[PDB]
Amino acid sequence: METIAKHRHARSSAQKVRLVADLIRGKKVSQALDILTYTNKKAAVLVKKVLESAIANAEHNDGADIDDLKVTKIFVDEGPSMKRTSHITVVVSDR
Amino acid sequence: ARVKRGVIARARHKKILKQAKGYYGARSRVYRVAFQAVIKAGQYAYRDRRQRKRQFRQLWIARINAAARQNGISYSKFINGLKKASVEIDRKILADIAVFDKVAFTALVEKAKAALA
Amino acid sequence: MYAVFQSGGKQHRVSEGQTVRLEKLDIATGETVEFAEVLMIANGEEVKIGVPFVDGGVIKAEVVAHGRGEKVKIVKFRRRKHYRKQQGHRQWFTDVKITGISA
Amino acid sequence: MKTFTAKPETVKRDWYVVDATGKTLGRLATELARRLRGKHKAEYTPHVDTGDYIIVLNADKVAVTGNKRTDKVYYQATFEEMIARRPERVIEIAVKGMLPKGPLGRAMFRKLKVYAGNEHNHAAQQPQVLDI
Amino acid sequence: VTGSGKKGSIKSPIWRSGGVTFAARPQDHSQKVNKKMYRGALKSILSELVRQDRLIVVEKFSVEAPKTKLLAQKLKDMALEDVLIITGELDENLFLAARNLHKVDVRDATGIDPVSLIAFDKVVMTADAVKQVEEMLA
Amino acid sequence: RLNTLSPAEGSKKAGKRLGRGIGSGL
RNA sequence: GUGAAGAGGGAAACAACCCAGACCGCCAGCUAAGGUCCCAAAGUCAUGGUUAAGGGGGCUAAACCAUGCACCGAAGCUGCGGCAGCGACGCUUAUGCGUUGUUGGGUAGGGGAGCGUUCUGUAAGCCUGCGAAGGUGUGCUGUGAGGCAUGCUGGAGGUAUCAGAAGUGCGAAUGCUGAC
RNA sequence: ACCGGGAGAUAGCU
RNA sequence: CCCGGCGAGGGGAGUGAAAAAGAACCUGAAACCGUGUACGUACAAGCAGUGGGAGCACGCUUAGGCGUGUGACUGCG
């Protein structure tokens, strides 16, 4: 049980999204959402949307226990240049 | 008869790089610098293949002198006695004996002292 | 309890049973070789070498198999004059198992 | 086989007592430096601190002959005032100058403890008696 | 190379899309061979074939009808599958029969070439072809 | 037997391609 | 004679000073110049004298003179192993050698011997959907350029031996094209 | 002044 | 079918030999940029290699010891 969700071609610099994401790596979803709520950086909204998509995929496709899901893996990578885009990836699993 | 050089060039670059692992950044990634680093490392290895004999000889001499001084005889006189005693034990074996078992070294040094005069 | 002997010009101190590295001495794999050149015999009370090349005993050795050493790269090139000269070397060797030392 | 190499963890380093009563400065310092480097022991290794702990007592009894009693200079500072204020500093500087430069050299030097009085709290370490 | 302009130059070989430094031109590779040399080579090849038992002489080689099946059967009966049949007058029936078979080639006496002789395993030439070749080679 | 045919010794010379490396001379 | 085109050791550092010409490996021994207080491998050695003159600390010798025995001391010599050239007795002839003596620093330059990429005949042969070319790691192998088998990806072509022809082997030309 | 051609122009050295 | 803004994007189910073929679609290396694992890491140096080499993690090894991963210290550079 390890759900994965990613957002491709995000209209934001990769470095800023990495800065935002590093704040929640290894944390738990319950407090990860709260941490992302008050992050004024624009990339915070995109990261929160990706995390919500990951949680939705885990709860629907996989069995249950959304609450105890942990952000085992989270990263951002450089994307195609039109300016540089970015790809955000988040993996949520019980372990 | 046009010929493309991609395959051979890439193979040569891979062969050069694979023997350059762990050279602190650019030297392990930039071929223009990696080749020079590999050549310099090879030259240093060639020099050290000869300097190793000198270093180990010096270490063995130091160990033999240290062991002998405990018996009250300097290294020079000890080796002179061994040579006059007609013993061909080299310095490596002397150091090994001194660091392993002291009884054999005591026998060697007492025989050397006896043969000094 | 060991013995020091000279085989390829470099003295080796060998204990019983343990195999030791030696130069490529031309002898068949099956046959055993006797190293009459024993420079020291070690026991509880070691016998000293009154005369060089003590003949009080001999050392038996068995050549398990021959073989070539590890690849070594030599660059005789120097002075950084933009020339490359790399040569490979693989020294021959023999691992000989010595069992039993005669005092 | 490969030549034996001293292990920086299992090597046993002992303690010794050295007294500078009427001892030449240069010779005493040289013997101390040689002993601290571990060269006297058979397990000497250049890159391993195999030396012992040597205690120097009564540094005020340092002996130097000739005109060096006043010709010597320190940094300004002079031999007389320096020896009066702290006899240990002369031996300390000599040993530091007569040891390798680097972390290993400073580590070996640290093992040298010197005092101007015979009494020392380090006697609990069962320090052996040594003569220079 | 189409274009111009010397603002260096864009048509230089180093520059991308530039002309080739040593662009080739349509040439001829034919090499002169002495007639006596050619005849000597042919004689040597024939002698080598003779000594290797790769040469078979037949009094006559004829096919009743221009049917490839008959030619294939005849060659099979003689344990031949890759041969160079040589004769005198080029019979229409034999040529038509052998045209389809890739492993079988038939040529007149004067059409023999070193490559054809060497490449094919066995060479079959009729007595009339033998005389014609002997006269030709002098 | 086109494979067996080979030129006589010394008849053909490969030639020197100068400017290609250092181990080939020029 | 030294560099050009000669490595190494000593003079603290240093091309010009001294010894000394590096075929390769060895955790073997013996030496030349220079050294034997520590830093740093070797005599805090012996003999009879002078003394205050001394890269760091220190030196009453750890400064100097002469003598003796020793030791450290390089890629120098020797010990073992391995490769190649050349002069020479023998079979041997197209080569193995039974060997012998010697040589093997090297820019410019000359000569000799080789690997690798495309296509053509060999080749309507061989391998290959039980896995081709390419990519990517491993092991073996050749003094080297290289070759061989195989893990994963790749999912359909590659080409043995022998010959012929090149748009044939990139590390820089303020080189050109694309990307960072 | 600009564009195409003589022109892969001409001596020089890098 | 679901999350997502009735977007973009993505995860399931399914076709498909393969979705390690998804319309940015054969093969997909390098520089460059990221996460995880193991190791070292902090006064500037000027090299950041090389011989020795403990220690630190991972396998073999009956074990000893060996290879792989980094390289405290140390001769030379």
Numbering used by the authors:
A (entry chain S): 1 to 82, 98 to 110
B (entry chain Q): 1 to 117
C (entry chain R): 1 to 103
D (entry chain J): 1 to 75, 86 to 142
E (entry chain E): 52 to 58, 71 to 201
F (entry chain L): 2 to 27
Give me lines lifted from the publication on this model.
The 23S rRNA consists of six architectural domains that, stabilized by the L-proteins, define the shape of the 50S subunit with its three protuberances. Here, we present a biochemical and cryo-EM based analysis of the earliest period of 50S assembly, utilizing an in vitro reconstitution system with purified rRNA and L-protein components.
Proteins that contribute to the formation of these domains are bL17, bL32, and uL3. As our system enriches certain states (such as d12, d12_L23, and d136), we have been able to refine highly resolved maps of these interesting early pre-50S intermediates.
